[PDB]
Symmetry: D2
Subunit: 296 residues, 4 copies
Amino acid sequence: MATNLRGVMAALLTPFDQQQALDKASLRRLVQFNIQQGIDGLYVGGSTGEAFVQSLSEREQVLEIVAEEAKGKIKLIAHVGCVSTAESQQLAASAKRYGFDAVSAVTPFYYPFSFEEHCDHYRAIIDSADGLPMVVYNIPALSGVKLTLDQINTLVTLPGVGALKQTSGDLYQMEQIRREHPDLVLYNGYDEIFASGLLAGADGGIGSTYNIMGWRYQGIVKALKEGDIQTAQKLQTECNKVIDLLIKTGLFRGLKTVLHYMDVVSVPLCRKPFGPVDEKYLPELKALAQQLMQER
Amino acid sequence: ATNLRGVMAALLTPFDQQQALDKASLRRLVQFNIQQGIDGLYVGGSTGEAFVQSLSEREQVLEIVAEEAKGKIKLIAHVGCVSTAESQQLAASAKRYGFDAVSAVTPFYYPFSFEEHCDHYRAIIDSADGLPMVVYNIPALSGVKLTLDQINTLVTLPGVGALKQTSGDLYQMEQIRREHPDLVLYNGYDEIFASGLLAGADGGIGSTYNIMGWRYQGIVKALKEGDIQTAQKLQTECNKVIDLLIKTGLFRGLKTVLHYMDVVSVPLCRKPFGPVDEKYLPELKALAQQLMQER
Amino acid sequence: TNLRGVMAALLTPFDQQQALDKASLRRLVQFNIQQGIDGLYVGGSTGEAFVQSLSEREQVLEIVAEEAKGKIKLIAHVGCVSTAESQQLAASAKRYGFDAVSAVTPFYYPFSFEEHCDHYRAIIDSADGLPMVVYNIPALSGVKLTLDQINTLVTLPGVGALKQTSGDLYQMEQIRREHPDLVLYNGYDEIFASGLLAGADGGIGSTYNIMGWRYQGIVKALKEGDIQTAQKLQTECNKVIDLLIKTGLFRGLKTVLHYMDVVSVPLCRKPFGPVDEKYLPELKALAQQLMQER
Amino acid sequence: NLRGVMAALLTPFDQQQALDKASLRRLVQFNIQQGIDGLYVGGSTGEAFVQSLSEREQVLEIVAEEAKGKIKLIAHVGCVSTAESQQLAASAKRYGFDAVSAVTPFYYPFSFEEHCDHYRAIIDSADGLPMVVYNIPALSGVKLTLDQINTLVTLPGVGALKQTSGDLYQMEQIRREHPDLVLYNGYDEIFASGLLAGADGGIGSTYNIMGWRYQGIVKALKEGDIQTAQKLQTECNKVIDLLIKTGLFRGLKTVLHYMDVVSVPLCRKPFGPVDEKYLPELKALAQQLMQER
């Protein structure tokens, strides 16, 4: 329990004020909100936190505040990945200083890096994490990096790696990874296939929609554990009705908007080039917020 | 059953040393599947090497399978060709032979508009003279990538009664089930069968069912009983097998296992498919032994 | 001589009932010859071979040979997914007196590179002497070859050319650099001029059926160092290709040919649909333009 | 006038991965001395995406001090963030660049409308400097349609398009729709063919070591000497084949190092060093190019 990274952890969003600057009060509120719905932990500074439109100092600011709010209450994973190895190393050292339980890094993108270069990138960050386990992050849809099973096997067996965030809808690969690494912490990355992902071999998950309905995913874990397939399917179906909507509205901004109606986030904007939510979607987003609050 | 839902094996086409149809082996394979407790057979699809067969050869297989299993298990005839006219010919034959339904892969190679794909299915349904159509979505091999809206339109065309979904996208599998509560939905990738059923599929069609169909029936049973652990363990065993078969070459590996099970006389596939690398024979023979003992 | 040159990818005219229109096929062959085409590529994608039976493809090969053998070069595309079927067509092409055979990389099923190599070897054997034109068209076949694999295919015993339907002109140059004497056909009409500059020494295309003289004009312009003329000609070809892609390539070409009094019925085989009536005015005007120009 | 052959500038670093100012100045002067028309600064080639905003500004400022008024200067100010891109655009204006450029924001999926507003916002901050839209699907993962490209290049304030695409059908279509558009060929290995299709110049990283060859291809095609154009392109590709094998940026830096222009040929991590098995070819290439011109 003290060191176990397995579980359902929300990919944290970064609330901004009207001027696009960090809204500290809302960030703290979002951390507490997640803790209150029984989340196992938080994955901070990843895609969902709009890290790639933030500076290093801004990412460190978020990491520090979240630690003050949640260190000791729930598990904390710091996504310290940048395209640059040196920048990733700086964030890794900060994560350790703030007391995070683990670090994580997306495969460096934009430039075509060889597999050997990706491996050395992880090794360097693991060195700077000084003790904190590394969570390899595979997300080809956004990074453009397509790894083979053999390459994934090599990455997850590097000294210092304790988990893999698998943001892939290939559940054959998910099963193969589980079969090859029986003890590996394996996070399902696409919320919309959570139930099937666990069945395939994942033993937990990290997702952005957990911010507004994390209890449903915890419910799926329990349902499958008790052999209640009907309940597991029903919960996944409800999650997907929500995901359908969020994808149409824009994932991060849609989530922030729902959180705004739940009195957690003051201003639901994302940073440019992300645009605002189309007004035509507000009725459904407001109704969703009302439903989720009634449910919780 | 009075419906098309279930676990159906995608039938392989046994050939002799001359690459010609081995009728005796085909009959044995049909009977072998029936004894395994399979719900039906999907004939003339990718797995039957239909695309390296002539129209008359495909028809010959349909006729023989019908002779062997009509009335015993469900029979689905894949009549799809790039040509609409050729597909219609096979559909008319399937009707004549008494098949329970027809199926057609989205026409490939040439890029066709979605409207043309729709008209293609309509024309085949017309020739099927009453037999329901099983739309076949398999982007990996066909190169045709349909959107959810397009899939919804195809499955609702008059005369369509099912969808064979050979896609690993389980978000789409769930969306299809959500939009069509009563649709017969076959999981197409054997290696994700358990997860596919959980996502919304209510059955499946697969090549590996030929050598271990009881395992998939076991997964259906396990999930229906809420025995998640048994379902997972069964899927794991199936995947250990699939890993090997993909390494050896899927169709030829399956035929080789069937050969060691005394079902297929000569385990050859038609060129350009090459033979199995002799280095894999020990593992394939051992697998056959394991499966036979498992029954 | 050799197989280098500008060859039209022949279309297969059909009648109202989707059956081969022999008279129109003959007219189209003669029409191409009169345009000054160097040869014809028969039985390929453009001839709707993949929606034809082996017997139908053979019938087309036989008729074209009767009409143009000895007048222009004739390449028979005998490719099928099946090796055995491809071999039957190769043997027929030999029997009819074609100058060479060609085969698209077998599609649909995933085949190993070794299997692709053996496929070409088997067809070459049945071609009984006719040189093989390897056919690389990843967009339609789904088969993506590496430069090393392409080099291996073009050097197989019996291979005499490569039809490169790829817009990658870096690879076009690399192929020319590795094989200085290789007959290399540019496959995408819309980049013909640039393809030749990159290293192709000729081309095979479906639009050659209605304006082959323009492509011959580009070859001449580049040969004489007239860059602007080459560019202007390519620009005109592309204005046409823009339209044809909008209307549907094969049916659009057949429709133009219909207005040129060459093809009786401009239909393609199902699942190909008919041309949208709204495009007829543009297609008719194009036919008129090309006839006046020619 | 922004039409021409301009080198995509590399950013020299020292053994500790910090900016090597002296080598940066030397590389700028080296390019000017070989007759380059201008420099494209802070793009992919400058390793901008493994640099901080302040580091990118430092490079822009130094380059301006060294070349403003002598050759054309285009500042690539593109970032995923619009605000960051605007900061660099404002700095580019302050340093006196002739134009700004921005790659389509990447990683996160953005709507076309969002891409358009991104460019408009940067153009506003460029305070007068024309914008060079940058299309490079291979690296960005953003695939634009012809209609979308047409919309982007027609936005007020856009004066050119850097087309890093091997699709020469689209290159021709773009030229057909925009007769007066400054259109830079982005893949050095198809330069000759790109110009024939419609490009009227180019921006490339290999121009740093053999820009005169590309200038030579422009001249050859203008004079109708196709043979010379092809020979030059062939020689460029023999070099490009090698550089892709060795790693493009580090290969170029290594050649420049043997030419005594760049002190340390390293790229920033995660880029690794050059495999020593390639040094014989790289040294020979440097020797060859120095003798050539």
